[PDB]
Symmetry: D2
């Protein structure tokens, strides 16, 4: 038969852990991913989150405390029986914050694979002679992701024809940043708890008495289980919780993004307007003038403000804190999983039975075409560049004003137009610092 009648994607745990675990393709609306007939991509502007990593130091501290309670007791029973032959996956505390480098979901493998992939898809946009600059925010795991992606794309010519430019995450950069700063609630008050965690705590304690696990330990043990895939092919800890518990966990993580780095915080659109507006400039200037390939690397919390700025994936009302709002668009596993990315494709199209010859804008989020709301008149439900321009011009909030940015800091982004072509930053030249975070190499 032609089509399968089973539809099981929704059950995947990959779509139920916020952005802690492995990358996954965003659920598609059914729109063909390749350029519509009569069109071709003439410019690409992408922002990819660092790949799969180890937990952060604070998350690791909490995971360790929960594991201490687990470990305070003879041979394990029930769903925790695997614990009799199991070792925590973080080599040592200095690895917290770093990209993973083992298993099918390794973060560096993610970046490399994505680069090789984009080479086939957009190779036609590089003549094999030009030196292409690529950009990374100044943070270890992000830089390492950028490096492996660039190496995947440029391959044999990575050393000579790709030029890594690292942009400081310091606020001093103002709007000339991949990680804009904004200074002057619900986010601070999140409990990270939902009733299903009580069921898990009760079930775990009952199978192996003596751990005194709370709903809070459950939350951290699930954070732990979701990060395990980033370093290993399978996680037995994932199996110690139920499908319904994972559904609640993913939602707890969705709330964090929504309120701390999304539409739940009204200043996020202004932060995301920096990239939204600067990229609009590149689209309007065109590939011949500005360049055809812009590969950017940053964090999950830098992509969500862009989506907010663009007005896409905006829940109709703020997400409720005490229950799962099923079906809302803010499903983080389809927005910013490890290695997630927003790719803006500029399409050069000839006339079609539904559109005039011209330039169109197409958005792709994690391999799935994301229609620009009601602007879907061009080929493949794209948006005519002129309409796209009026929409952003009319709706993007002002960054410096909204964010009280010092008049002495750069007021607009320049790196896409003012960059270096040297290749010294392409390869790492020093060990990964202990829990390395901010970095410029």
């Amino acid at each position: 038969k032609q089509f399968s009648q089973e539809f099981r994607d929704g059950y995947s745990i990959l779509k139920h852990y916020g952005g802690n675990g492995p990358y996954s393709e965003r659920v598609s609306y059914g729109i063909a991913r390749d350029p519509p007939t009569s069109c071709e991509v003439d410019q690409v502007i992408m922002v990819k989150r660092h790949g799969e990593r180890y937990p952060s130091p604070s998350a690791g501290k909490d995971i360790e405390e929960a594991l201490a309670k687990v470990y305070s007791i003879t041979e394990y029973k029930g769903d925790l029986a695997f614990l009799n032959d199991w070792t925590y996956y973080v080599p040592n505390e200095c690895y917290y914050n770093a990209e993973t480098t083992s298993g099918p979901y390794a973060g560096l493998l993610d970046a490399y694979n994505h680069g090789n992939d984009y080479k086939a898809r957009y190779g036609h946009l590089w003549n094999g002679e030009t030196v292409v600059p690529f950009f990374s925010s100044g943070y270890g795991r992000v830089i390492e992701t950028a490096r492996k992606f660039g190496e995947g794309f440029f391959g044999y010519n990575y050393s000579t024809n790709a030029a890594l430019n690292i942009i400081s995450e310091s606020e001093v950069m103002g709007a000339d940043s991949l990680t804009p700063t904004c200074d002057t609630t619900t986010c601070d008050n999140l409990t990270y708890q939902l009733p299903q965690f009580k069921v898990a705590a009760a079930r775990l304690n009952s199978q192996n008495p003596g751990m005194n696990l709370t709903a809070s330990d459950v939350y951290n043990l699930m954070v732990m289980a979701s990060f395990e895939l980033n370093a290993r092919p399978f996680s037995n800890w994932i199996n110690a919780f139920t499908q319904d518990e994972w559904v609640s966990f993913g939602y707890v993580e969705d709330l964090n993004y929504y309120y701390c780095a999304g539409p739940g915080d009204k200043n996020m659109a202004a932060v995301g307007a920096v990239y939204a507006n600067a990229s609009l400039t590149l689209l309007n200037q065109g590939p011949k003038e500005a360049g055809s390939l812009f590969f950017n690397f940053a964090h999950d919390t830098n992509i969500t403000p862009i989506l907010a700025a663009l007005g896409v994936l905006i829940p109709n009302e703020d997400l409720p804190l005490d229950r799962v709002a099923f079906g809302n668009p803010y499903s983080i596993g389809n927005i910013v999983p490890m290695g997630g990315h927003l790719t803006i494709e500029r399409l050069s199209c000839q006339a079609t039975a539904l559109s005039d010859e011209g330039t169109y804008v197409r958005l792709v989020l994690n391999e799935a075409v994301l229609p620009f709301n009601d602007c879907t008149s061009g080929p493949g439900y794209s948006c005519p560049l002129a309409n796209y321009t009026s929409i952003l011009n009319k709706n993007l909030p002002d960054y410096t004003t909204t964010c009280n940015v010092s008049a002495s800091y750069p007021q607009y982004l320049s790196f896409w137009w003012n960059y270096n072509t040297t290749t010294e930053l392409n390869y790492r030249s020093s060990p990964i610092a202990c829990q390395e975070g901010d970095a410029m190499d």
Copy 2:
């Protein structure tokens, strides 16, 4: 590795043809389908649409006219090359309206498969002795679906322990119906164009590959209607391949608009029509399995299930669907609501106390094998709704049917067949040929 990183379900054409083609499992929110730990289903109330069928007579007329234009020209080229060795799938015009009986997607096979399946899942709710009445609306394809489902469920004991009760589709039945009537003294549905820009691209591409057909955007619509129905009789359809992924996305949406406005939230009277079933089933839930019975298998149409969903206030778009463009992401995706053989199953859960709930009765809704959370009432095990809350919500929100629908005072004002039925098995097996284009029927 543990999980696949590819997510392709959204591309399936089965989710892009409204309710014309084969049945498909509804896209899941991830909630476990089986009863939560500490719970068990003690009562089941299901309403299933007839299985996969041939087009209706009017649709067939249109399909045939479009095919005449296709056929008005030497060996076919391009994507229509398969037409050189292809025959329309409707045996003859008398088959329009009937359930299909060939291929992996055959309508009767769907019903029988669904019955065998429910036997394993809910067999514990039948003691092997009781004679269980099951209900079908008075329409040929619906009756045939009911019969095959019942046979799948009761199996060796279908002729003795299942009792088919057929409920007339006539308005004279008032609320004692599986297909309540509502007078039309009150529009967007009548003005639907069934057109979107992508159809122009298809027409242009088809005409260019095989000149001389003069196919229009309308012919394309009907040719797509035809392609979607083909799967109902055959395992593969090459016609599906003659249109692009983007064309199918538009077609599915054109079909969603029909349901939305003709049989859904787009028509404000649909909630009242659906309140009949919603309220009557609420009565069975509150009465309980011991008193009322534990198994209620009902069979009707797609347009009988959508008003129930509207009545319950689930899958309600935030705003009426726009007619001129695809409103991507809206909940009204018909391939996940009423595909051929689609169904809404209400499970009553008897649960012991859990770390998050008291011992008690809970209500779970399952639409096409996917648990459908009752909006904000998700406090019970498996995101279910406490029976008491479920009761207040329906009592507070269900519109009045007879009032809203100006039902004659002389017609039944209440549904009774779930309590007043026959246990004879005389209607279990078909006893006459399928009439030409058989629609309304009582056998």
Copy 3:
């Protein structure tokens, strides 16, 4: 990307339980299943095994004794924890031998599904007027499979245009049989141990997790027999999960040995038994569809299909299978030969000339949906065998049945039912209850 790099089919438990569990498509060599370009099937001769069933009475007795030991002990631990909420799937002992009627793998659902499927594939071979006789051996579960297949294929016209002919399994039928008899005046089969080392690992692991059952390697064998049969009545089996992948690999092989030696090439008389069908069908192929008829649907047992494969000289291990270890990679993998509902379909192809063959008649063999090349005779389109060569090969290699099997001269020496049959439809529907443990039957 275009193709997946993961190849997991080999791990499926469906391919590791001999013929006890659900039907599965045979592993393909990659040859296209549909008729080659320039060809079409003009005649079909199929023999299908009864669908998924409950264990036999003797197997059930053994399963029950093993379960008694399991049950001789407080709440279950480890892999047997599910036993705290589990009930044996055989309703009562009178169900042993019967076709299953619940779950996605239900035996009757299998038959009905297969029929609907063949309707789309071979419908063109029935003009909608002719009354087609179909044949079943005289055994309850086989008859019930035949009936459901026929109903799936003929659908709306099953009661009028299909004619079930039931052929007695008695030896008195001689060669005019779907289940020929062969006297046993002549062993390895009788001495099979049904044991392999992995069963010791299972027993040890099970006893250690829940002490007090004293399960042996034999109990493990029967518990695995039980687990494999569970799928026949239910969608999932937790018992399957209590054994390792390596244990299942050994179990499947223990089952392969049974067929090999009791009903296969391991017994030199099986080719002669299978020659009856092989030769009679060759006659139909040579006679042609116009004269003999185009559709021959036959239903029998797994042990009736394996002798045919032996007679045809296909899937013959290079050496007899070793009894003490798994001979990995040998062609005698029963899950790819006779799983529940398994079938051998002979398609006669009428082909025009192709760049590699002359216009003519070719013979194609399909085993469980996979084209099975006739050894070195693969010169026709789609690796088929020219009818003339097929004829010489069978004529030259098929053993003589009556001689080899010492068949009384007073019994039919030739199969005739394909030419001498009834067209009445009286046997199409079951008219009495399924007898307790119903085996031989003529209705």
Copy 4:
């Protein structure tokens, strides 16, 4: 339901093109891939073929000639319609022989992915402090594969703790080689033709008249289509041929291996005995003495002689040249596809209900456990080390004698015991030479 009833793996084109195309997991007998309960791997000896590459210069010449005939004619029709918007995938002739670096099947991505994978599976065999040498035969694409695998496995410590040793392919190395030489028929006479190629030629010519394609052009166009995946995610050329044509093509390629580098040539077992015997030595010495990780890289034609030497996957009779011998064990897509590999795992097992405590040998070919014929008495159908030793000692042919190896050449392999720990060869330091073949860097 628990299991799918559809079994479609056999139809995959990945299993129907000899060793020209993308890597694929070998079809499994069902044996669990992980170490049996009571056992653990204490030593790994692997030989992996270079990853996906571009055709060789000679193959490329032929592909080009066939494409010239295709291109000798207005807009393309039928199955070749994609040709109206298609470009050959070899950048320029200097790329022939090289590893691919684009698409999901890129050869370097293959190596990197495999390394990350083995890190999770065998990481426990490296203490994070030791410098592990790894070996590659002296050939460009093989060296590049070795490098990316080593980088995947050692990750952050690749520069310091992995030491690439490159072994010359010159015959002068004698038995101290990953590519032993042997000098003094059916192989030379292979036609590379089967009737199905006539059907394709006839069908292609009929759809686009004027190309005058022969059964020979068809063969080369299929060689071309199979190599296309190595550089791109999809190949439309694959779709221009039928399933039955691909079945014949794969068999034509199987014949080549069988007769030119397999059991069809009686000297192949002697060539493979070098590795078979040397590795047996490592197994008998053990991990504590010899080392626990041996990652080797060579060619497809170096792995087939090892399998021949071991007596595994030996057809009961020589493959017929004029027809497909369906079901024979010599299915190259399950033996040596691009990046294929033979991994020997030494298992240290405690006593089980079926075996004594001890050392066992397990063979894994392309992720599938390959039982050692009738020696399957240990856990997971493994072979007791002692039995494995007697079998090889009793059956391996003599290399130097059989192959008339000069007494002045090394008579036994030494590199596994005599190697360097320097890391200079770890990273490429010069451009990829035009059609680079033999290389020592």
